[PDB]
Amino acid sequence: SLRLSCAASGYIFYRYSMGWYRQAPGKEREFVAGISYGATTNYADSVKGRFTISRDNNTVYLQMNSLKPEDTAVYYCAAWGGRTLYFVYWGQGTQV
Amino acid sequence: FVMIPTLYSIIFVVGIFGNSLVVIVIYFYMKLKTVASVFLLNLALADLCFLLTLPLWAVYTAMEYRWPFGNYLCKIASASVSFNLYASVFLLTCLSIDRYLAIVHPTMLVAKVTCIIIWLLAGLASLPAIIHRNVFFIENTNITVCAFHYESQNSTLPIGLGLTKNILGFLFPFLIILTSYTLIWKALKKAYDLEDNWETLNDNLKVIEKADNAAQVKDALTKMRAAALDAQKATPPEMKDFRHGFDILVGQIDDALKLANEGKVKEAQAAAEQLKTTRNAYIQKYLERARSTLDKLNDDIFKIIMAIVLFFFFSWIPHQIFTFLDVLIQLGIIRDCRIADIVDTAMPITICIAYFNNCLNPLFYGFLGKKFKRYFLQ
Amino acid sequence: VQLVESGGGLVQPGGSLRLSCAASGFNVVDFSLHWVRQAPGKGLEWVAYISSSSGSTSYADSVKGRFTISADTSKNTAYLQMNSLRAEDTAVYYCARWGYWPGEPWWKAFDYWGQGTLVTV
Amino acid sequence: DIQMTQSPSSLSASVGDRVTITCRASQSVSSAVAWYQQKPGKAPKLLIYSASSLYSGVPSRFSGSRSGTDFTLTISSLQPEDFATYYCQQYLYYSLVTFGQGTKVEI
Ligand SMILES: CCCc1nc(C(C)(C)O)c(C(=O)O)n1Cc1ccc(-c2ccccc2-c2nnn[nH]2)cc1
Ligand SMILES: CC(C)CCC[C@@H](C)[C@H]1CC[C@H]2[C@@H]3CC=C4C[C@@H](O)CC[C@]4(C)[C@H]3CC[C@]12C
Numbered sequence: 001s002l003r004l005s006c007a008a009s010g011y012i013f014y015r016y017s018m019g020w021y022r023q024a025p026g027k028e029r030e031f032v033a034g035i036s037y038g039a040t041t042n043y044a045d046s047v048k049g050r051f052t053i054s055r056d057n058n059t060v061y062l063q064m065n066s067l068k069p070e071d072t073a074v075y076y077c078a079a080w081g082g083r084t085l086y087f088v089y090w091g092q093g094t095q096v
Numbered sequence: 097f098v099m100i101p102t103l104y105s106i107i108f109v110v111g112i113f114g115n116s117l118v119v120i121v122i123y124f125y126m127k128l129k130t131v132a133s134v135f136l137l138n139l140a141l142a143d144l145c146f147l148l149t150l151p152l153w154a155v156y157t158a159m160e161y162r163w164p165f166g167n168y169l170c171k172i173a174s175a176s177v178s179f180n181l182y183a184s185v186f187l188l189t190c191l192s193i194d195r196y197l198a199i200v201h202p203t204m205l206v207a208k209v210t211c212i213i214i215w216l217l218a219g220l221a222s223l224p225a226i227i228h229r230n231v232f233f234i235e236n237t238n239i240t241v242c243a244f245h246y247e248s249q250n251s252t253l254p255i256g257l258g259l260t261k262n263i264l265g266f267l268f269p270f271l272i273i274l275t276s277y278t279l280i281w282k283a284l285k286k287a288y289d290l291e292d293n294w295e296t297l298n299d300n301l302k303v304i305e306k307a308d309n310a311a312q313v314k315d316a317l318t319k320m321r322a323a324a325l326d327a328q329k330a331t332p333p334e335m336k337d338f339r340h341g342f343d344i345l346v347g348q349i350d351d352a353l354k355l356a357n358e359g360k361v362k363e364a365q366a367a368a369e370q371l372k373t374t375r376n377a378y379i380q381k382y383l384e385r386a387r388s389t390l391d392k393l394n395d396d397i398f399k400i401i402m403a404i405v406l407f408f409f410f411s412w413i414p415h416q417i418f419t420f421l422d423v424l425i426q427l428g429i430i431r432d433c434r435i436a437d438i439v440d441t442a443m444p445i446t447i448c449i450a451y452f453n454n455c456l457n458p459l460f461y462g463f464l465g466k467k468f469k470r471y472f473l474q
Numbered sequence: 475v476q477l478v479e480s481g482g483g484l485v486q487p488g489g490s491l492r493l494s495c496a497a498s499g500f501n502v503v504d505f506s507l508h509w510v511r512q513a514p515g516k517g518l519e520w521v522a523y524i525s526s527s528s529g530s531t532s533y534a535d536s537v538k539g540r541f542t543i544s545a546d547t548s549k550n551t552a553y554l555q556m557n558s559l560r561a562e563d564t565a566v567y568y569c570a571r572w573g574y575w576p577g578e579p580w581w582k583a584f585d586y587w588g589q590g591t592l593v594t595v
Numbered sequence: 596d597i598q599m600t601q602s603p604s605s606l607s608a609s610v611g612d613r614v615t616i617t618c619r620a621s622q623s624v625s626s627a628v629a630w631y632q633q634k635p636g637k638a639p640k641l642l643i644y645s646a647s648s649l650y651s652g653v654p655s656r657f658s659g660s661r662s663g664t665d666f667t668l669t670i671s672s673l674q675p676e677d678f679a680t681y682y683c684q685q686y687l688y689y690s691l692v693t694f695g696q697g698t699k700v701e702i
Pocket of ligand 2: 393394398399402403404406407410
């Protein structure tokens with residue numbers, strides 16, 4: 001059971017949703033988890049039960065339970081938001 | 097929200113119609129025989145290029161911020177909007193410089209090369225809108241948006257994008273507009289000082305030949321000498337020719353002033369009429385250059401360019417202010433949730449006022465310019 | 475360069491008095507010598523002037539018809555002849571220098587004033 | 596017959612203070628206005644000519660300005676020897692010389 005962490009402070013973390021994206025071998029960078037400033041979790045249905053994202057007070061943590069070989073990839077922690085003009089911040093990319 | 101699609105639609109229709117008319121008239125009847133016409137033609141072309149992709153943003157805002165046009169069209173539309181801003185800015189700066197040169201220092205190859213360079217520089221300054229602008233499926237939902245992407249290394253990129261707008265779109269260009277229009281005002285001041293002073297010298301010269309007493313002649317020569325001294329100071333923006341022109345002139349008012357002091361009206365009026373010979377030999381060549389500079393302000397192209405320059409920077413003032421507030425928030429200089437929400441809720445409104453000038457630039461031709469021949473012919 | 479007054483003093487009202495404006499340095503032909511009088515406790519008032527280059531004598535309305543100003547090129551002096559002196563002419567008389575128009579000397583107004591002489595009626 | 600008017604008839608200031616004297620002409624005389632300093636019992640001395648130029652051998656603290664018809668004399672830093680009477684003269688022509696009423700500077 002691993003656990004990934006992503007720190008982003010300042011402009012981010014109080015107006016942009018934070019979450020994780022995984023670069024699967026299919027090369028698509030699909031959605032994994034996402035938490036908003038209202039603490040509304042939203043995970044992909046493929047990993048809905050296994051993972052559990054968590055927001056702190058300016059770091060977001062992703063909790064992993066099963067860790068099947070189907071989820072072995074590089075995880076980018078994004079940060080997306082903006083009511084009218086949309087901005088996306090991408091993480092460095094951590095391999096598991 | 098709900099007026100942004102409607103404002104964008106009316107901008108699109110009015111601007112495309114007006115800019116098509118402007119391009120047609122400038123290229124057909126004005127025939128690009130003036131440098132200001134080449135820059136105005138390029139401004140109209142840039143406005144048309146912007147308005148071509150404008151309907152995409154109208155529907156994109158209309159369908160609750162959903163982008164069905166694809167990543168390529170997202171990149172192209174963002175690049176077109178940024179290109180419109182920067183190209184219009186640079187063309188207005190060059191128009192102001194050209195107006196300053198025409199007013200103060202009375203060239204198609206350099207004009208066209210400058211237009212090409214301006215288009216290339218505006219395209220290069222819109223490169224971030226091409227690189228960091230991709231469609232983004234919001235989480236696992238089907239909603240797609242044309243978002244601005246960043247990276248971990250490019251954490252200061254949002255500062256760079258916001259500061260580039262303020263500096264390369266408002267700050268530096270507004271200095272050149274101020275610099276050019278201040279030197280235009282300085283030249284128009286000394287062109288009017290020489291013209292107004294000579295009118296006082298010329299108005300009282302009619303009084304001398306009309307009056308028939310020593311008192312009225314001496315009082316007329318008194319106001320002619322003060323005007324001649326003032327006019328000698330209004331040196332047009334070669335130096336001795338202007339100064340020696342009035343050294344002879346005031347020397348003839350004195351000779352007429354010391355003849356009216358003896359009660360000799362016949363010699364006071366005869367010597368007063370000798371100022372005609374000095375005017376033509378030395379001064380008349382400068383009253384024409386003062387009149388030619390002074391009536392160029394009456395040219396309708398000067399009104400059009402000044403109106404376009406004045407409204408463009410005034411319409412972009414609200415957006416550059418909120419852009420500067422946004423970059424301060426990103427820097428953390430301003431740390432308050434109350435201020436941030438005002439900036440976020442006003443950015444779409446200011447971004448619409450900023451680009452409203454694309455549909456008003458053609459209308460400045462009808463209002464300011466009196467040469468709306470083809471606007472009635474067509 | 476200095477202007478010195480002479481001939482001032484106490485004279486009876488209605489008499490005739492002549493003032494002098496002997497000068498050293500410059501030449502009288504190059505400058506116009508003016509006369510400015512200052513009443514005791516009052517300000518300066520322009521009285522008369524001469525242009526020895528051509529002859530352009532002028533007077534203020536308060537002194538015109540009585541005062542007479544003349545200059546001597548050989549003596550480099552300017553003479554002011556006063557006639558019909560009344561109780562209003564008792565003032566300190568200054569002889570001032572003023573250049574001719576072409577150039578900066580004109581723009582420099584009275585700059586080398588006389589030492590000042592007292593005239594009492 | 597251009598008439599010169601000096602509103603500040605009497606001014607009181609200490610050493611090192613800033614004193615401003617204004618002058619107005621009846622007609623639109625050009626920048627032909629001279630400022631003079633007259634100590635009691637002494638002939639006036641030219642300070643400012645052409646309404647802006649500073650006469651040779653005069654301290655730079657004296658400043659002359661013109662605003663159309665309004666002529667202004669200014670002293671940046673007052674001095675113990677700067678307490679005298681100042682006159683405003685328009686010299687548009689030889690026969691058209693009129694001086695101001697005169698302003699006295701006190702301690
Ligand atoms: C003519 C305005 C176009 C427009 N309106 C809106 C909204 C908020 C719906 O009103 C949006 C939007 O959703 O971002 N857009 C796209 C856009 C905006 C600014 C710019 C822009 C303007 C000046 C300078 C730079 C940019 C830029 N470049 N890259 N990203 N923004 C480019 C594209
Ligand atoms: C206030 C914001 C919205 C700008 C709108 C006004 C601009 C576009 C226009 C409207 C009226 C225009 C003025 C109308 C008349 C003249 C006189 C002319 O001899 C010089 C230009 C000048 C002075 C114009 C300058 C530009 C102008 C001020």
